[PDB]
Structure formats: C-alpha cells, structure tokens
Design a protein around this ligand. Structure first.
Ligand SMILES: O=C1CCCC(=O)C1=C(O)c1ccc(C(F)(F)F)cc1[N+](=O)[O-]
Ligand SMILES: O=C1CCCC(=O)C1=C(O)c1ccc(C(F)(F)F)cc1[N+](=O)[O-]
Ligand SMILES: [Co+2]
Ligand SMILES: [Co+2]
Lengths: 362, 362
C-alpha cells in the first residue's frame, strides 16, 4: 500500500443505473433488496429532462435515471436547463440502454474536490466524460470515462444532490434488510492489461490482488474503494466472454453490497425471490459444506456452518474470512448481477478460492 | 346492438407491453397486481431475439416483451428465426420504447380464424401491421394498426403460444388478489372522428356509448370486447392532451381489469403501494360518499358504502351499477394507468357520471 493516489478519495458515494423506465426498476430493487425510497427528481419537482429516483439502505445509495420525451425540454439549453444531473443526455442514455440494456452508468466516488480531481485525472490520461459542474454553490460533480460506457463520477461537498427532494416520511416505507454499504464494483474488459494501467494511471490506485478468467483489484489509500477488473480466457465456457457478447461491450459485472447480518438479509430476500424480488444462483451441494468443517471449522460453529448450507452461502484467508452469495442476473440479459458479502477494508479477499472449492463437489 | 361485426370475435386474449427490460416490469406487476408467473420465452427456452414473460390472473394475460442484442440473432432470417412472436422487430420495439416509454403495444383479441379476420380487416380499411403467421400448425396470429403505434392482434386456435414454456409449479408463486378478466382498453386519439370511423370500419363494431374530453365506445356483438376512444377539448387542463404530449402521440390510456372481490383486491394492492406495488389516485373527500347514500343508498348497504370510503372507491345506471378506482400512472410518464372495476357485458357504464359527482365535493 504505497498510498500513491493522485488525489484524496473518500469512499463510494452512489451507483447510477440507466434504464428506460426508472419507476419499475426502482420499485423492484426496493422490494427485492430492502432499500427505502429516499429522494426523487422528476416532473413533480420540476425536472422536465430525466426522472431520477434514489434508493438508500444505510450508506448505500442506488440511483435510477430514465429520460423523458425530448420535446418536453426542447425549449431549454444547458445554462437554463431543469435537470438535476447536468451530465444527463437523451442521446447517450438511449444509446447506452439500446446497446447494454439495464446496466450501471456511473460508479460515483466522493472526493475532497471534484474540480481538482477532474483536472488531475484528465492530465494523467483520463478520457473526460463530463466537465466539472457546480450545483447550488455547494456540490460539484465531474465524470471521466472508466471502461466501456461506464464513467467514474467525482462528487465533492462543502442531502444527496440539489434539485432532488426528500420524499415524505409517510409516503415511503422504511424497508431495511441489513445492507449498509457498497463493498466493491467489478467490471469486465476484453483486456485487463490496457484497462488496469489506464484506470490506475489517472487515479494512482495500487493493485490489491482452468480458471476461466484473469482479474486484478485496484484500491485507494485506505482500501475503501475497490475496483476489480476481469478479463476472459479461451480454451475451457468463459462466462465473462458471454458477458461481453450479451452486454455488447465492456461494463460493470456485479455490485458487491455489504450487510451487517448476512443471514437476515438472505432470509429476507430469499422469501421474496418469487414475489417480485431477486432470484439467487444455485446453491452448492452439501459436499461443499462437508469441506467447510475442515476449512473454517476453527473459524465458525457447526450450528452456523449448517445454517450457511440452508441459505447456500459461500465461505472463503490470512487477514480474515468472508461470506458471499451471488444473485442471478438482474434483468433479461445474463450480464449484471448482485453479490452479497459479509466480512469479519477488503478483508477476507474476493472469494477467489471458491472456484477450486466449488469444483471439489464433483 | 345490430351485431354488425364483419367477423366473429370471441373475447380479449392478452395484452402485450413493450419495454426495454421485461424482467423488472414483470416482477413489479406480478407483485403489485397479483398475477402469477405463467409462461416464458427467452434464451433459456431458445429465443435469441426477444425476452417475453407472461403474467396471468384468472383469464387475464399480461405479456411483457423486451429485445435482446441484435447480434445474437444476426445469423438468423425470418423463415429460420427463433422468436416465439414472429411479429417482433428490434427496430420497431426500440422506436416504440424511445418514443412512448413503457406502454401497451398490442391489444390481442381471440377470433374464430385469424387468417380470415386479417383479410376482412385489411379489405375494409385496416392498415396491415403484421401478416398472418401460422405457429406449429395450431395457432395463427395476425396484426393490424389500431391507433398510434398500438396494433390489434388477432389470434385463433384449433396453452398460450408455441415456443413458450410453462414455468414450473414450484418456481412460481401462485399470487392471486382477485383480478380475473380484462374489461375494456381505452386509448387517446387527437380526433375521435377519424378514429371511431376507422376502427369500426374494418371491424363492424357498433357504438356502445366542462367535460374536458369527448369519448365513444366500440363493442362486439356480445359486448365482450370494449374499445373506448377519447379525444381532448381545449378551453378548460385537458389531461388527455397532456397524455398526447408526454406519450408523444396516440396510445392506450388505461386498462380496466375486472375483479370478483374489489374490496379484497384493493386491500391487497393498497398494502403494497409503498413496497414495490402500484400507488392509487387521491381518494375523494367524504362529501362524495355523503352523496353516495342518496345515489346508491337503495343499491348498497351503509356498512359497504362506508367501506368504499375507506378504500376510496368511485360508484356510479339503468342496467346496473359499477365500482371503480384508478391507479396512478404505471411508470415515469403520466400516461398509461390501471383501472380496477367491479360490475353488478359492459353493465354499469364507464363511470361517466363520476366527472360531475367528483366536482360536487367542492
Ligand atoms: O469479487 C470478485 C472479483 C475477483 C474475481 C471474482 O470472480 C470475484 C467474484 O465476486 C466471484 C467470486 C467467486 C465466484 C465463484 F467461485 F462462486 F464462482 C464467482 C465470482 N464472480 O464471478 O462474481
Ligand atoms: O372508462 C372510461 C372511458 C369513457 C370515459 C372515461 O373517462 C372512462 C374512465 O375510465 C374514467 C371514468 C371516470 C373518471 C373520473 F370521474 F374519476 F374522473 C375518470 C376516467 N378516466 O379518464 O379514466
Ligand atoms: Co465480487
Ligand atoms: Co375505463
């Protein structure tokens, strides 16, 4: 950990999904994941450009943005626009959604100064996506191309964003399953070589870490933001190659959401998989948990290990051990999905040893 | 009722929504309305063109179709395609979804013969949308332009559709709130004149029926399919004019879903409005229900009338009385919404008298 970050980054701020209808996506994710309706920005607030709805579960913030009819804001220009997120564009959102479907547009990171972070990034090789825009003389947002069509959004403060309105405490249900923070966001790239040296080039992020894939992890000075990047290899399958085929290019593979009580979260979500929520990947056979008594027998009690077999949880090092489960793809395309992890910054790893442990069941 | 239908139509068959992501829309509607996951047609079944998911609640069938990546079916042509619905097209679906957002694409009606119904319709002035296609030598589907970009789909049998697969009885939750059938589907048109004489021209459907709108209803020989069409008037507001502005053209305004126990359905849905379901329109003041004892006092008991005020239900003629409630718009745009009705074919009317009864509260 040389702490070679070119500028001071704080932590993950929010994740912005781009879809054609932000309502139906925000309603499903809120029920399937337990994120309360936080803030809104649409025609009811005065936004004639895009409809944005924020879901929050602890510190995690999920934003869902969809475009309106361009004729509504036809009489507007950028200086007098009414969009809460000035980085928005009708052409880019419909191009992003027609090429990738439902996917993550921007991985937002809170920094010390967004205007300074934009200049240092661009001067070190970052492709500028959106110039720094000041908002109500309090919030500043900037965006640079991350990989594919996903952009890295810098945000700095001196409340979510201006223009948004906090929903009424009675008009929103305080849903909460246990998810608190965003752990890491992983993206798939055809070549990790040019990608790892690019992202770490304008950020100074240091590297934190039969296979079917090759991957490495970038992290900040305190390992609070973690950006793993994968690359496929041919000669097996290669589920990451099928990602690039169905996603039609690079993009964010999965979001890792941290929870305080992974058993309560998986109990709340598995009871909702078939009533609007999210379906989980197939659980490993008891052979996997028969070997769990040998790997984490001294780390976990048999009553708790057997409970992991009931929910189908994957366990896996030196600094500590982590628990993890993977949700099925979040939409029609077999692309983006969700990973629920519990650690006991970046302690426990990323379940890289589970690839060999899962094959041992056969 | 002259029974002047040019061909024998049976009843409403299904409704097909067109969105960019069929999963998130089908998961929300199933939880918010109580429709079980019926059949699917996607890559898991062999469809490399579109992802379609059928929701059923009694006889009502809601279909949700979204396009895949065109490169997946790039090596296919129409004779050797793998799409379950041959009427599908990547260009039309993305054009429909980029112009109208989430909306109804096809109002399907079961007929005696789809090939004959297509020929009689086209020969009487219908604009052909999709030619008749035979499916597994058992099902025949045909489509003609209805109004705007909505098309009227004819379907005839000799199971939903071939290519689809019935989901497993264990992999689907038997959700059921009480909705059983589709009553009527209403569309907004800039001019009902050219629209009413067009739709009734190639179908022979007879007319069944300060205002802010002008409307008329078309119906079959047995009044089992009901297609009301509205037109705005300027000089008030005009919520139908705002429909044509946000929908960017004509389209289906609202779907009327019939239920057997309107009180149970509204009790199941109102408890789910803030947890992924559908929000309802504002309920009328008790002044509206103070006049309910004078209009339907001899038609309903005070214990049941007071219960209608708790759920905020609208009541309204000669043949009988009907109950009705309107859901808020189903997505980002203030366009398409849902109406829950209970009748005691087409008996009770369409709540046309509620416009004057609602204004009496002031
Ligand atoms: O967290 C990461 C990034 C590094 C490599 C990786 O595959 C990670 C996964 O989240 C992960 C871990 C384990 C498995 C397993 F073993 F279950 F297949 C799968 C994944 N994965 O591809 O998401
Ligand atoms: O069913 C119809 C079609 C004919 C006219 C009409 O407006 C119908 C409605 O479903 C309806 C009825 C009453 C109201 C009221 F009174 F609550 F405003 C509103 C509608 N509507 O526009 O859907
Ligand atoms: Co991960
Ligand atoms: Co109606």
């Amino acid at each position: 950990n040389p702490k070679s970050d070119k500028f001071k980054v704080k932590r993950f701020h929010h994740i912005e999904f781009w879809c054609g209808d932000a309502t139906n996506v925000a309603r499903r994710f809120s029920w399937g994941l337990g994120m309360r309706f936080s803030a809104k920005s649409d025609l009811s607030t005065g936004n004639m450009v895009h409809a944005s709805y924020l879901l929050t579960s602890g510190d995690l913030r999920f934003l869902f943005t969809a475009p309106y009819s361009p004729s509504l804001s036809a009489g507007e220009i950028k200086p007098t626009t009414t969009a809460s997120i000035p980085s928005f564009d009708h052409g880019s959102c419909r191009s992003f959604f027609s090429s990738h479907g439902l996917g993550v547009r921007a991985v937002a990171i809170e920094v010390e100064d967004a205007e300074s972070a934009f200049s240092i990034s661009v001067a070190n090789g970052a492709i500028p996506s959106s110039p720094p825009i000041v908002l109500n003389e309090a919030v500043t947002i900037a965006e640079v191309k991350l990989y594919g069509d996903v952009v890295l959004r810098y945000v700095s403060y001196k409340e979510f964003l201006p223009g948004f309105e906090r929903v009424e405490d009675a008009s929103s249900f305080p849903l909460d399953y246990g998810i608190r923070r965003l752990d890491h966001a992983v993206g798939n790239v055809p070549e990790l070589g040019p990608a790892l040296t690019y992202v770490a080039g304008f950020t100074g992020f240091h590297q934190f870490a039969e296979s079917g894939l090759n991957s490495a992890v970038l992290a900040s000075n305190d390992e609070m933001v973690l950006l793993p990047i994968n690359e496929p290899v041919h000669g097996t399958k290669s589920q990451i190659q099928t990602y690039l085929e169905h996603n039609e290019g690079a993009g964010l593979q999965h979001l890792a959401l941290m929870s305080e009580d992974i058993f309560r979260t998986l109990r709340e979500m598995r009871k909702r998989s078939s009533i609007g929520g999210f379906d989980f990947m197939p659980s490993p056979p008891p052979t996997y948990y028969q070997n769990l008594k040998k790997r984490v027998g001294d780390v976990l009690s048999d009553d708790q290990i057997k409970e992991c077999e009931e929910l189908g949880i994957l366990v896996d090092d030196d600094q500590g051990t982590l628990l993890q489960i993977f949700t099925k793809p979040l939409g029609d395309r077999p692309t983006i999905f969700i990973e629920i992890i519990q650690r006991v910054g970046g302690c426990g790893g990323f379940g890289k040893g589970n690839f060999s442990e899962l094959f041992k069941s056969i």
